[PDB]
């Protein structure tokens, strides 16, 4: 219902739906936050439907923002400092992530940021804040935002022989921020081309399971649930993450993602998002299984 | 704000450290029942040039004893181990040479300019912080914290009169003394260029905003930098 124009890519549709549902944000005993929002990146050739996903998400959801990696203002994805002649004094112009605070920020052309935005994205993605300290303004600005990135691989075509790290220019600290990576590659299949053309044409002619208003109401209702983690699901999460780390250890010496604790917390958030989708009181092992399935396929298709 | 009267006028200059004895009182020509306050000075004490004869006798004795050079070198930065030749160079900088005016009117600077390039953690900044304290006139500046106008001189509009007036930079504030430029390599090139006249000619020639003068900058530049 949310992606009728999209042909195939069921795993990507599921991942972005879980991004909409999101995980539970938490605060430690020492007043330090734990991130609840997940972040999803979609790498693909310019000929594929990566922009279509972002456009559908931003058309659907309220409070969301669409932006390019390049800035259409002095402020970009993050804030910038500008004088105003009403006082000849410095103030902060807000960026896309702040405008998307408590919402979704769809970022097309994610690979082509400026250095200022690319560095400030490190704090915004994980700490959910932007800490500006310049002349005339000191401010820790809030960016409690889920990011839906779309990226272009180097040389346009996604080279399957190369790893995903070799395909894109995103640095390893940036890649660790994302909870899910998805790959869209333009296959030369005749039936797929005919299906894409048919879907576009018959949808365009049609205009004259659930409606988007119903999905909006259900999503807003579902996001009020805060699923707990059952003991069996705790054991499932820790077992699967131990398995993931030792599997990565089997090929850690070669160039690889080199998995971190952020992916454990991504697994936790994805299981919580599954429980939120079904409005469950607590996370169950089946939710953990689905979350690990999506995450693990992301690991494998990043490595290969 | 201070108010100095009669013979207290010109008893102190900018950059001096003083103890002021006076009467805290209102000026008597946002909010309503507010009056600005100032101190009517009746005693100035420079906390640190008129020497007593006893002090002059002590200084003559110090100049007369044979190892005064080594005594001064040991006295400079006594907490700093080693670096004795650099301390001797700092002694030469502190005492300085003799200014000379030649028959054609050209003047030669007596001040000694001393650069300390080298490795970090080597007490260069501490030697600068000693010289600022020890020189009769001494101004400490960070190179990265400085600007061309702020070093040499600034031209600014007087708010109460609309005229453009002159403001002394560090090299004017240190006239007749030492400028300690710490982390000297961190300055931008255009700002290091500004001090070229003041280092050699010991003047700051200004032509800005219709005011055109040649301030004096008879001072020694002690600089510290890293590789």
């Amino acid at each position: 219902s949310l992606f009728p124009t999209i042909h195939g890519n069921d795993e990507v549709k599921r991942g972005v739906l879980l991004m909409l549902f999101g995980g539970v944000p938490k605060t430690t005993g020492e007043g330090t936050s734990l991130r609840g929002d997940i972040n999803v990146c979609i790498v693909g050739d310019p000929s594929t439907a990566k922009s279509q996903f972002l456009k559908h998400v931003e058309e659907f959801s309220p409070r969301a923002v669409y932006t390019s990696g390049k800035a259409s203002s002095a402020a970009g994805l993050t804030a910038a400092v500008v004088r105003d002649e009403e006082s000849h004094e410095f103030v902060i112009e807000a960026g896309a992530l702040m405008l998307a605070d408590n919402g979704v920020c769809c970022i097309d052309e994610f690979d082509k940021m400026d250095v200022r935005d690319q560095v400030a994205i490190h704090e915004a993605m994980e700490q959910q804040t932007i800490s500006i300290t310049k002349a005339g303004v000191k401010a820790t600005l809030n960016a409690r935002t889920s990011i839906l990135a779309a990226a272009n691989p180097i040389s346009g075509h996604y080279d399957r022989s190369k790893s995903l790290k070799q395909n894109i220019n995103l640095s390893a600290p940036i890649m660790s921020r994302f909870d899910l990576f998805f790959i869209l590659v333009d296959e030369c299949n005749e039936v797929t081309d005919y299906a894409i053309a048919r879907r576009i044409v018959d949808l365009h002619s049609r205009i004259e399971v659930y409606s988007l208003d119903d999905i909006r109401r259900y999503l807003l209702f579902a996001r009020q649930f805060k699923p707990k983690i059952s003991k069996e699901s705790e054991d499932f999460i820790v077992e699967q993450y131990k398995h993931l780390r030792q599997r990565d250890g089997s090929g850690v010496t070669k160039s690889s993602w080199r998995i971190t604790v952020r992916q454990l917390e991504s697994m936790i958030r994805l299981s919580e998002a599954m429980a939120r989708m079904h409005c469950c009181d607590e996370v169950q092992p089946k939710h953990v299984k689905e979350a690990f399935r999506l995450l693990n396929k992301s690991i494998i298709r990043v490595e290969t | 704000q201070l108010y100095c009267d009669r013979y207290l006028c010109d008893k102190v200059v900018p950059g001096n450290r003083v103890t002021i004895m006076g009467i805290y009182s209102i000026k008597k020509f946002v909010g309503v029942g507010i009056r600005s306050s100032y101190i009517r000075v009746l005693g100035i004490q420079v906390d640190t040039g008129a020497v007593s004869p006893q002090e002059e006798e002590e200084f003559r004795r110090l100049a007369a004893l044979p190892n005064v050079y080594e005594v001064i070198s040991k006295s400079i930065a006594p907490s700093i181990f080693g670096g004795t030749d650099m301390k001797k160079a700092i002694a030469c900088l502190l005492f300085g040479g003799s200014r000379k005016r030649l028959p054609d009117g050209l003047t030669r600077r007596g001040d000694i300019n001393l650069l300390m390039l080298g490795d970090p953690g080597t007490a260069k900044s501490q030697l600068l912080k000693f010289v600022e304290k020890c020189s009769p006139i001494g101004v400490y500046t960070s190179g990265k914290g400085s600007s061309a106008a702020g070093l040499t001189a600034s031209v600014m509009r007087d708010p109460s009169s609309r005229n453009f007036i002159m403001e002394g930079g560090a090299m004017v504030l240190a006239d007749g003394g030492v400028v300690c430029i710490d982390e000297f390599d961190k300055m931008r090139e255009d700002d290091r260029v500004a001090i070229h006249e003041a280092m050699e000619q010991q003047t700051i020639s200004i032509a800005k905003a219709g005011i055109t003068t040649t301030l004096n900058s008879r001072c020694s530049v002690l600089a510290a930098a890293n590789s």
Partner: protein, 703 residues
Amino acid sequence: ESIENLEDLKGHSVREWVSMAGPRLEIHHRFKNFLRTHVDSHGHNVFKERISDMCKENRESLVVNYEDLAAREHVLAYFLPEAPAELLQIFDEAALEVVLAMYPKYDRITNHIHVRISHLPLVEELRSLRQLHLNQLIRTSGVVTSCTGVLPQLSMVKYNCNKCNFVLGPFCQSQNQEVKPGSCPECQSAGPFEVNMEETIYQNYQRIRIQESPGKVAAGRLPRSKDAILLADLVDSCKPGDEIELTGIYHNNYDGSLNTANGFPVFATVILANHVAKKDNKVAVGELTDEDVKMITSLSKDQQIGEKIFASIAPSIYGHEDIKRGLALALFGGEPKNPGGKHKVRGDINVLLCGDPGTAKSQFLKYIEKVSSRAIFTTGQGASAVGLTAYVQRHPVSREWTLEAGALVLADRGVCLIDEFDKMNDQDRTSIHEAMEQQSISISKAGIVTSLQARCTVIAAANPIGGRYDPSLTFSENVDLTEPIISRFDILCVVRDTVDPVQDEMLARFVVGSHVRHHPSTYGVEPLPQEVLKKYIIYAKERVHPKLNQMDQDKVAKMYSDLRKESMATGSIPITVRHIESMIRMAEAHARIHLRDYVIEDDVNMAIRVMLESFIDTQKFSVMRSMRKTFARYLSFRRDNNELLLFILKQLVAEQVTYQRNVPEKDLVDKARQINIHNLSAFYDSELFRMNKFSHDLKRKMI
């Protein structure tokens, strides 16, 4: 005399009611009784202690908590937000004559005492203030944007007659208009008059502008702001940039300028302040109670206090015990000093957390921001040289150049947190050299030539080149920072996300445990509660100043010399004195953690351990074995010394048993205080005396 009453029932308005003599006297008596009879939950007479702590320091200002004023006296809490000026005046009088009962000579110190109300529950967002709140007590929060200087304002003014010697009697000055006499009663001359500047009574005045905090609601919108007036002792309670919490009376008056600006009868508003707190300085030494000091000093008696404090830093982070140790030493800090009155050296300790992604470095910085007072946080390109140090600007109303505080000046006695430090620009990153060592920021700009104080501990986080740390290279070979900036960091920390399945299981189980524990709804020692830790830190940084008298000079010198020798062959940089002074600062910090007034050998051993373990961490992975053996064997990895105490105990027991056949714990500790083995507690928690069948009891003292 005027008779006592039930207060809450009346036909008047509240202001009129509390203005009348009868209920005014009743309110006075009630507040007097409340001060002289209120008790803590444990039964401690609260306001006797608070008045004694006020009169000791001559603070002439008594802070009262609404949340127990409402508990004790209901009607006073009822009238207070409704008629605050009148009730606060009555409270001031009652508090004054309570204080002059407790300390009868205190009128020599001050003739008037102000009651300051705290924890007012009717908090208001700053933009949500309306006409409904006028002339009522409110509480708001915001960042101070502007402050006037402290100015003298007329309070009780006597006017000299314009034509003769007579002084016209006192007029009580208002905040609305300048009170005036009109004409003199001795001779009815009129119009202008002279203030008697000597007999007129003035009061301190300071007008501040506060606006909404940038991260609170201003999500691209412009923030709203209000003016506030601080009087008497409330001046200098805050500065620009302070996230204050302000209680005050929301007061309004006619303003012709606003009327002509809006074209309507619009009245200006201002907050007459009654209490100023700060939302970062949640605890202060001026607010610590005797019970807080008692429980702090009881905690210091525990021999596990170092481990408890280390375990108490960022308790939701598994592992990283070396990081927690270094951060504790930096959080407590060393002792600044100036030997000879001519040579300054800093007391503050700087830390750098380098390592690969997903290792809680930024999380550590955020924890330090939360726990420590006067802390600030900045990141990478978000920071600038000028904003970090200090900035020169046209003043908004004067339009003359004015210097203003940057990051390291606003944190002049706190912690500046710089996340993603490797990603700053060089011109931004080199600006902190003077602040990091000489602890001043010297500015020569636009006619301003001055040096500001920046006595700030810098804690930074960074990634190596390429994001991932490679053990094949030294720290210097993959950090990309230079020697002048590396050497200014007292503690270097390296964190690596290397695979180890058992450790991964433990870490993952702890992370899942944290996630389920903190639902909205390596430690082995248990932490302190974080409130207790904040009180402990703020007590230790002010009430304790560790002195240095002996630290085994030859040991430290030998250690430093061969540390320099080994470093010459490899890739981290002990510049000559900074590492020696880092060890001195860390020993002082460990003494401060234990609340010691004097540094001991254990603190020196801890400092040496921290320095050497950090240095070993900076080596290549192949070189760590040889380096670790070199320093561990000779240079004082002083783990324990149980054998000497074992044979001392056995010797004393052998002599005692021989004497008996033809209080032993006292006999043991006598020889232990004679020989330099004084930390006997390790011997009692070690198995060496236990398998020799010895045991201890604090009561019986037999062994």
